């Protein structure tokens, strides 16, 4: 703890989600937690719902109802879909918000009831939401209120692509993407599929054609090639629980090479702490970057003539989610990026 | 009747699935074991899981008297194979479980492997042991170069289609999975469970031995060079293997075409099953079975499908697919000892 | 399929055990079933629910009401604890019955109703059920209507134990135990508990001092030792899908050696197919009876003077539960007992 | 970083222990590595060795004879074994030094010999070497030169027994102990035994009767109870890779219960940061301090009157390794025990 505290609040911190923010945030020298909330476990402590955070001290949880933000700086906010929109809607104006569900995401709010199931109940302030990615958006992140932290298959997959396409690198036509990801994204619901006996020792893919991340990576892709991009992307269930994998396979523009790509993305990202390009051939693993705000790529040549491979690796935890939220906060409230976010990934 | 069996290079897993499949298997009985670092060891010593199971102690490989043998299975090294199998008896079916003769350009094999084929005659008559692909052959073949495991779960589903003229040649993008059972039991500090438990990573990238192999049954269903990007991945998991395939569709067909295609060829054939609706391929559910689960999805890109298909690395991606073929060759039912269900969980 | 086809019902498929008794019987050459039932999960398609036997031919689910036994020979039941009872209590009379819950296990009423919250519902019934402990009791199973199957822990330890206890070579004084198993005993139900990213990476002891398993255990030690036995059973659930050990620290009697311990077990065990002792100092492990039938053991000599250690490992749904339910019926129908029995171990 | 850097090599970092040593000190604000030795990985960058610490600036591994500690003040060391003791010797008479091997851990230089066959080499340094159990010799550590950090399976067995048994609440006749650790304690060494494929889904005892640990835990054991005190010590290789879990059968002092063993370990660590009693009944999981340099223990009551259960839990890595060297040299430095030591428990 040092310089001035800043008073947290943490909306819906009965998941992974909110116990990787806690995590964080026992690492962070100015970020305090003051306020939990979690509704089905009101009056509880958190270390009697995570027990491996029992040595922490954090106050005990209490109806998102009933939070008071009137002493609070910031909100990480991990509440249902619709409700989250309503809440963020009501908080007070002295505040820095990062939602780390999807509802602010998507521009289009008509994209949203589509793939939701509900009419935006935030419109007004839809138009007010900077997308968190970090590394692309850093300068509307910095002076915004509001910000829709990326989903984690998203994250994996703009950082690379982004830079490309808007270098006009890559074409817009047949990206085909097969995404690898660790359980621990389908959350701690009781659910038969995601039992350690349904998932042990063996993969299969799923969401196919139509995942929900598909219009949130679209539209990242759209707003880089000035045009609409329609992609192919194929999640797979991996039997592990932290990691993600995310290989793109692109058509290189005329006379590119994968170097070309290669040493684009190297300088766009240079001067970057957690966005890392591999050297020379080297091939990213998603054990190495687990439990680090990391982000390691690299890109390669197809066997294919004019075709490319570039693979991305991000712990969905962190990078892909509670990383990248408070990573935004940090820059939100002015201070170094990786304030807190320093951890060297647990390897082995 | 009893048929003598021989396995050449057995200290590996495929010498104890081998082992294992065989113990199921009413006629064939195996007589001869080899391995050149563990020759004298009992095989229970080796393989401690199959301890109750009475097997001769392994030998050195020149050591091994093959007159008393009806079929040999084999498993050695990526030039030993050639040479050895060259000398071997006349009177002998084979099957090679190893990539020494299946590729038919002899060319293509010193690029991929470094050296010149060491049995160009011997070559020419060897039959790639695709099963269900290449039946007729395989049941007139003494020598059968048994398929490799990316190779069996990606051309079963693409032969057909491209034979039919279904799917294109062009942009066909292979990102397939597998079971870190497939890098042997070398001990190696890459395949250490600290090293790949929880983790996944890519490998052999563009230049994977497998391709040209995959290339060649292609490249002869379409009656012209196949190019394909096949990538493969490690996986934190003993066995199983996923291929996913993304390919581009001739024009006015669409995915639903190439699942009845797919359904049609396969409809009578008990080891390649086509799954209903558009129900999902897992690993786990043919781990420990010589099953090849599969089917086909709409990309959401206009004009283009996915296909999946998986199967167990360690059986119809190896041992299984052997003995199936050496049931085919020996004139008994395919099925033979292979008819366990996949077990999970 | 060999000659003489026998008839089987299974009340309760749509679990593990269920899916077990599947794959085994698709193994019998004269075993074939003929009835399955599901409560909630009535009318479905078997492969529907087991997606990796699709490819087997069989009835679909129906109520256990819609049971009809008049064509059945064999029935397997697996039932929720109470309603076995009853539904047991009310069948045919000319059928061979194998029980793998644990509902007949227990021949003290009180003791059962004391460890499971209800009173037993088939007193009269219980007194002719026969523990399933194969090896144990197979002049009693083999003319027995009724037969409870043991359930996996007892399994793994009486084998051992009994015969060493009957031989007065060890002592029942502090009999100390630490088992583990594979979190495949614990069921599919949709548990938060038992979610992979709850097990994975990771152990913890359960059932301490209080677990089910326990006066199954103590009944047929005590039985074996003609005098009342009270020992220290620990179970750890273990980040693996199947396999179960059991080590027992025990006392051994009066000028007794590890070694004289292992030549009873050998005598008794040296024509028994599925109990096996390993040779010299080999160490039983897990890996190598997954989906077999065997139970792997070895004795050794303690570093404390008059002690020993026996290790017993079994697959927990094998030789733990269906698989001795199995073997079981062939012995009931005078088949031989390996009867579609001798699938070898799945390792790696 | 802050307040005067402590210059450190690393004898001996191409392991697991190396690797570790490194992502605990990057989060520490004073311990900076100059150095690091290994002979067979000499002159590769580290970053190579293990991919996942590729963004941290470390000079190259060099061979220890080539190793300079002119510009180095204190020394942590992996090596070998016969290899440490005489190397030790000859380091400068006024570096810190922390060795992580077990070769200063034996006090008795006979026991040394008379288990491991050769003499010991630095019998006179051994007499000034102190056993790095920091919360049971923290004022000698505080004062050594040379500190003997403690085995991993010793450190989550001593924590609990030695106090209870300086307060002779437990009888130090018929100490039983069944220990489970991730196969991480094995090393990074290319063995066939401890492939994934050899290891995943299944688990084996190991070192039966003859584990190295023996003298070291009994060493301890016997100082507490003023006797020589004989235990009964069987380790487990479980499929995980961090994690350990010590379970103590043991036997109370007379008119001693469960509760008195809590009440004990309860006043005696209550001030102390790294070992946790854990509240009621709760059960501690290796999975809830992997990461982490804690140790989470419970006592139980056993079923057999007048014995109990304790449970002890630690990350093998890091409180069974680097946690509690750094922990350690903390001390030895004058820096507060817990400097770079507060990452919380990665879970999921």
Redesign the interface.
Known sequence: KSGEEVRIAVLGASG?TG?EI??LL??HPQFRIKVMTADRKAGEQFGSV???????DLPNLVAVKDADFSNVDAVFCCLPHGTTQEIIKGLPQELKIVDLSADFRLRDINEYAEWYGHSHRAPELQQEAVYGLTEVLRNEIRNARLVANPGCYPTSIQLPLVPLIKAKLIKVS?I?I?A?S???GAG?????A?????????????G???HRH?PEIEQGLSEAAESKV?????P?L??????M?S?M?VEMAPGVTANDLYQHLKSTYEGE?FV?L??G????????????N?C?MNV??????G?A?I?SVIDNLVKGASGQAVQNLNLMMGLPENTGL???????
């Open positions: 992974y116990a806690v995590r026992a690492n995570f027990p491996h955070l029992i040595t922490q047949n085909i097969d690898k660790g359980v621990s701690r619901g009781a659910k038969e995601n039992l350690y006996t349904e998932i042990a020792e063996g993969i299969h893919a799923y196919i054609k139509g598909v329609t992609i192919s992307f194929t797979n991996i039997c592990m629980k932290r990691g994998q290989t396979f702490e890392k591999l050297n051939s080297s091939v990213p693993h998603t054990r190495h970057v687990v439990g680090s990391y390691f390669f040549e197809d066997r294919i003539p075709r491979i693979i320093q951890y060297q990934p647990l390897f082995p």
